[PDB]
Design a protein around this ligand. Sequence first.
Ligand SMILES: Nc1nc2c(ncn2[C@@H]2O[C@H](COP(=O)(O)OP(=O)(O)O)[C@@H](O)[C@H]2O)c(=O)[nH]1
Ligand code: BEF
Ligand SMILES: [Mg+2]
Length: 508
Amino acid sequence: SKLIHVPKEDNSKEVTLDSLLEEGVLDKEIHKAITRMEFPGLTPVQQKTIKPILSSEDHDVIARAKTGTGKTFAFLIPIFQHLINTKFDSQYMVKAVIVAPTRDLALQIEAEVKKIHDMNYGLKKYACVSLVGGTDFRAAMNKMNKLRPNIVIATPGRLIDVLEKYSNKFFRFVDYKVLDEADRLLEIGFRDDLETISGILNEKNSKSADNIKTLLFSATLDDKVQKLANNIMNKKECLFLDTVDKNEPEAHERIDQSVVISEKFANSIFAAVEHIKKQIKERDSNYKAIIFAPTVKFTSFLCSILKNEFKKDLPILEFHGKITQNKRTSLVKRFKKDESGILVCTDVGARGMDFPNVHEVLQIGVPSELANYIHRIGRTARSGKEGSSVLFICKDELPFVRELEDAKNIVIAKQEKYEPSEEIKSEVLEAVTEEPEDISDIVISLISSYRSCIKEYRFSERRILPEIASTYGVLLNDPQLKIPVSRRFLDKLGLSRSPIGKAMFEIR
RNA sequence: AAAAAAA
Ligand SMILES: Nc1nc2c(ncn2[C@@H]2O[C@H](COP(=O)(O)OP(=O)(O)O)[C@@H](O)[C@H]2O)c(=O)[nH]1
Ligand code: BEF
Ligand SMILES: [Mg+2]
């Protein structure tokens, strides 16, 4: 497979819905649906991609647009059009398969399809079904039989389950497959799954094993994705669409980024509380923000702190992989609607999730992966609206910020140091209603988390892991105290041979 | 222990 590049262009010709109703690209049924939405016009990415996504194969696509540019519709418009173009063939078969890295994002994409339906009841005939984990498998199949969807949105796990069972029944006539947040879906832990999905869909296609057309979408990707997606793309040639300069930062321009650096990792906690407290007062509780954290246990803990002194002011929402899928969905629908509130989450909500009018994005610690910094702050400043972001870290996480300049050319201007007063520390710590053995588990999680991204972020192992583990002493208000561990555990950790192990743990 | 992702 060979790639071709069509970069950004400022003095490009304007494309519009009326212009696509002319030229015979889009049917009138779709033209209505999007016009009803009262958008001033198609976003840059949407204008550039609706064709040649519809154009004749062979021609796989790869789009590159910043966060909040409406990439969803940018591949949802052509799919509906193709479904209209092929109305009288395989009308009871899946023709488009969309894959997303998280359940909530897959459900979001489904909702966006269902919005298009709401804007034009004539499009409802092209049914849609979400195939996701944490939902009733049987009920999903019953819905699969009842509606006979032309569009399937799914997450890799559940999708392989149904394909191994019912690929002959629904998926023998797929023409399009979409990888939303493509780069993540092509990373280790997802790549094998998507190769299994692609292989099954290609193997069972009625016409040709190279029939399916693959679309890759994300706000962060390079030329290395074509190399990494060579096994899932059938067409002889693939054209790369791009609405951001190669040198320009992948992050969104309208985001006012800032860094709050501290001595200790635990210091970032107090800094975040004070920053929120200022914001609530300064905005008169008219504050909608998302706070990211490294681990599930630390999110739950951070959520407990925020509830203890902001629940009076704002709603505090806990969102992570260990939340039941019913609560996750119910939580997502609320925060989408609410004008205010604090969403405390892991990287489940780093990518794709569209929460209207988020004022700020806060971060305690580093993200799961380098690229996810761009996606994290991308939760705000969406669809024209403005926004800012704050990154809370200690003086041992600067290599992450420097790596941000080396790799993704993400330079950040506003930076300031922070030191916690004795007053704020007493307030927070006195409000913690958690046993030392619970504090233990939380701190170990962070050690495990930061141990996992040492190489990627160019950290100094001998410095960070002690500092991370040291938070256990801070929370119990006894700095020199070390977290008690078993000889079998410390050995099981592998740090038994390291001098760093003694600097982190006390074998009790 | 460790972010997602089928029971
Ligand atoms: N103003 C405007 N907003 C749009 C347009 N297309 C989509 N949106 C909005 O942009 C928001 C987020 O878009 P999204 O699909 O998440 O963009 P993505 O992050 O690149 O995938 C949605 O809530 C849409 O309502 C458009 O053409 N104009
Ligand atoms: F780029 Be993501 F879909 F906001
Ligand atoms: Mg998106």
